[PDB]
């Protein structure tokens, strides 16, 4: 009895949670067109979700380009062989460690702020009014919140890496003096444009859809009381950055291997 | 509802198959395997090729030790193709680089075959080995 | 005028924010005490802020101590010098990418759901009712939010790192073939007590009383409508998150030059 | 309108990182195929680098060996733009330094010659070749 | 309940039955000690590796200095797969690495025994070791 | 109790895990500081070991040189546990393999005198060095 059919009860539960999750999805996007009535709404969208976290990508895109600078020096001095230091950062970067940490700091402000703001419109009664004056709310919420989501990731990956490239090239050539030309030419020709270019495009819109859309169905079905949001925004962070995590061991393994 | 029990199946198994048909397309040996009793096998591991020349004809397999007289014995792994071998040829263990992985080398010992070699097969034994070098023994045949 | 007056009417904006803080954490610490009727709902805010973080940090805490033993073994093997690989894992780790990434997925998760709880718990009206009721809000709701947010990053950050070296322990010694002892005798005299995990230990407290001052400050201090909240959960990850990667620079030019 | 040139900046910061990425950190003819045969190559994989005087000049593209032979065979690549290298010229598997890669470096030949030179073209064998060293055997000469 | 069954038995034993079936596809031991008496162990450490050859077979425990000799007591662990050492094996600090760190080699007393050489037991002592090399006077040695 | 057990857990996993730390990254006793002067010392920081046989006793404290003699002078810190030093021992600068650190050798005196020579104790004067060697006049001697 218990330990059989309430496996099997808390199971089905989560075919409801995969099914409702789809059908929101196809009735926001698949729908009648309208290009002067979103386009005025995907710009502010895309001000709220991409430009107030270009700062927070910037201030921790250089940071980790430069503890990968001081603590790839200091390992790598002794063997006289810091002329290879930017194969390291611009490696480190451009294949794991710009689609993934771009991503986790993504699904944290970007993904916490879609869920606790569709969540608490949706108990503050802001969701039947709307419904109620024959205007969808999958077409006025969800959908230019999705797609100023699957553009804001794949640009701030690239202002990731970029000055990630960049941070370890402030530590490299002109903290610790290693040469100029030395430096960056032993990183061009170990960054190819199939391999490391743009696979980390792939795998950075792969990441996009993925946290975009728990992060926005977190916040349509949550229960609209007062820990029902505090817990609908921690099951987005942890669910959309698994997904990340568990996405980019199946994506290294057949982009890289 | 309905509508949401046939897309949750819908819905996971087109993930599911899209998982395990990349994984698939992401990760089968025609071999027969010799054997051979060195004396320093100092530097080899369990996966360290095994070549001729230097294109790659196969992989250690085993690294077992003998527990009669203490030499270590290695199970080689020669890829179907490459078949006739005679039994007299050779074996090295050379490094690839200057500090690169061991790699255990070969040699096709062809000198003028008249009257007939032994051709290996599955589980036969390599008669001929070379041990690998180590750094005291050229400094002590060196500095004196 | 208008560039003289209104940066001195927008920054005196500020002075007051500081004070509004300020004086809230002074009535919701000094205070009259109660050990039997705090000391439950500790136990609920430690599950809450905690127990439920700690799904994210373990998988995250492997995954960026692997890429430091892949990247950091394939530009280290050309010189035969893999057996000091475990001096850059335990390294990066026990100095900066660990107080420091483990902070950011604290103030992304912990971070937004404590901003987005006490901001839709002021929304709702159950902080007007509770306060008419004579039961302080700030001895009740922040108090047991701010002790168990200064216990809960302290031990966050030591399963971070022991996962981590653990990860770079995974890829060095098992995977690529390293030796079983000449790995972990290279870690062992790099790593000191008082300089590698005292300063640790130093770093995350610090940080645990910064990201929990503000996180609890923004969605107190928050207004209560749609978009008020939207942009006080995206007010907590920037806010409280430069002041990380601020004080880290301020506390490793101290702790480590 | 005070959020619109912030997305007007916002596209444009993308755009000068995805530039500086492109330029920075990173900076296909037809080809023309040859064949040759060495006894031991050191280390080259295939798309190693082919080089006359120093600047590259071509890729590897197959490796493989010999059957009943044993002796293994390259498959370079080289541009159409270099169609006037003389047969008589000469392979030589040369290393980076000294813990570089591997490559393979050709010298064509000099020889002002009377008696009707040669043309290197299509389908061709560059023989005189010279097979690479190995450690091994360089201390083994430097002792006796 | 029938209809909430399957969903629960299919469930716990697809996770369950991938839970053994990556268990067999990734996957401590009885040792005994050994002492002996160096001069001069350069770079030699707790856990470095004791190999007979090139296998590994043990580990070194504790390296602790004697007082009013001032010779050190190294402490080894070989493995209990191996027991048939005699007393006449010798040991020597090679040199692996490249930052001085070093293992130790153990060559056997195989001599095809004359009377049952005493084999090794909990806390003996070998006594014929060969103390490791420094390179200031091997430099010294070469150009006075 | 889901709650208060869940809590215990975290309690108990960030106890695990801090053990691993400081049980596998961490594997005071009184001293007497004697003292040397030298010639040229390598690369002697402060808190470099010193060594008798291998096994550290005691690390470097002060590295001050002498005015109006110069020659550096060093100013050791030998724990008080190896009391038992002859005055007539040596000091010399090594180095561990190629590429490591400039450590320390102290080395003690067998001469089994019968006039009584003396005792190592506090402040005292370790006379008899030997000072490190400089790369560029070795390879004076080696070419002239």
Same mark, same amino acid.
């Given at each position: 009895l218990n330990a059989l059919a309430s496996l099997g009860h808390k199971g089905i539960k989560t075919l409801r949670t995969f099914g409702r999750a789809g059908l929101m999805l196809?009735?926001?996007?698949?729908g009648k067109p309208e290009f002067r009535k979103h386009a005025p709404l995907l710009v502010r969208q895309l001000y709220n979700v991409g430009v107030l976290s270009m700062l927070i990508i910037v201030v921790s895109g250089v940071f980790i380009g430069m503890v990968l600078g001081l603590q790839g020096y200091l390992v790598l001095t002794t063997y006289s062989a810091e002329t290879s230091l930017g194969m390291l950062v611009a490696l480190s970067l451009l294949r794991e460690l710009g689609p993934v940490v771009a991503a986790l700091l993504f699904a944290g402000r970007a993904g916490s702020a879609l869920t606790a703001e569709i969540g608490l419109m949706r108990a503050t009664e802001q969701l039947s009014s709307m419904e109620m004056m024959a205007v969808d709310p999958l077409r006025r919420v969800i959908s230019p919140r999705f797609w100023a989501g699957v553009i804001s990731l794949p640009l701030l990956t690239?202002?990731?890496?970029?000055? #990630?490239?960049? #941070? #370890?090239? &402030?530590?490299?050539?002109? $903290? *610790?003096g290693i040469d100029s030309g030395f430096f $960056?030419?032993?990183?061009?020709?170990?960054?190819? $444009?199939?391999?490391?270019?743009?696979?980390?495009?792939? *795998?950075? +819109?792969?990441?996009?859809?993925?946290?975009? $859309?728990?992060? &926005?169905?977190?916040?349509?079905?949550?229960?609209?009381?007062?820990? #029902?949001?505090?817990?609908?925004?921690t099951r987005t962070v942890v669910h959309s950055?698994?997904? +990340?995590?568990g996405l980019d061991f199946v994506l290294t393994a057949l982009m890289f291997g | 509802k309905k509508n949401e029990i046939w897309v949750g199946i819908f819905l996971l198994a087109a993930l599911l198959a899209a998982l395990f048909v990349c994984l698939k397309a992401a990760n089968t040996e025609p071999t027969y395997t010799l054997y051979a009793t060195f004396d320093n096998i !100092?530097?080899?591991?369990?996966?360290?090729? /095994?070549?001729? !020349?230097? /294109? /790659?004809?196969?992989?250690?397999?085993?690294?077992?030790?003998?527990?009669?007289? %203490?030499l270590p014995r290695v199970t080689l792994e020669i890829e179907?193709? %490459? @078949?006739?071998?005679?039994?007299?040829?050779?074996?090295?263990?050379?490094?690839?680089?200057?500090? !690169?992985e061991q790699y255990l080398a070969? @040699? /096709?010992?062809?000198?003028?075959?008249?009257?007939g070699t032994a051709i290996l097969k599955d589980g036969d034994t390599i008669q001929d080995t070379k041990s690998a070098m180590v750094l005291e023994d050229?400094?002590?045949?060196?500095? %004196?």
């Open positions: 196809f009735n926001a996007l698949v690239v202002i990731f890496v970029a000055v #990630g490239i960049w #941070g #370890g090239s &402030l530590v490299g050539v002109s $903290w *610790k $960056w030419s032993a990183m061009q020709n170990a960054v190819d $444009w199939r391999m490391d270019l743009v696979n980390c495009l792939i *795998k950075s +819109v792969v990441f996009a859809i993925t946290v975009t $859309w728990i992060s &926005l169905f977190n916040g349509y079905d949550a229960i609209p009381t007062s820990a #029902g949001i505090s817990r609908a925004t950055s698994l997904a +990340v995590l | !100092g530097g080899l591991k369990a996966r360290s090729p /095994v070549s001729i !020349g230097g /294109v /790659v004809v196969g992989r250690v397999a085993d690294i077992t030790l003998d527990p009669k007289t %203490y179907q193709r %490459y @078949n006739h071998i005679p039994d007299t040829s050779s074996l090295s263990i050379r490094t690839s680089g200057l500090l !690169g070969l @040699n /096709v010992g062809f000198e003028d075959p008249e009257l050229l400094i002590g045949q060196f500095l %004196y």
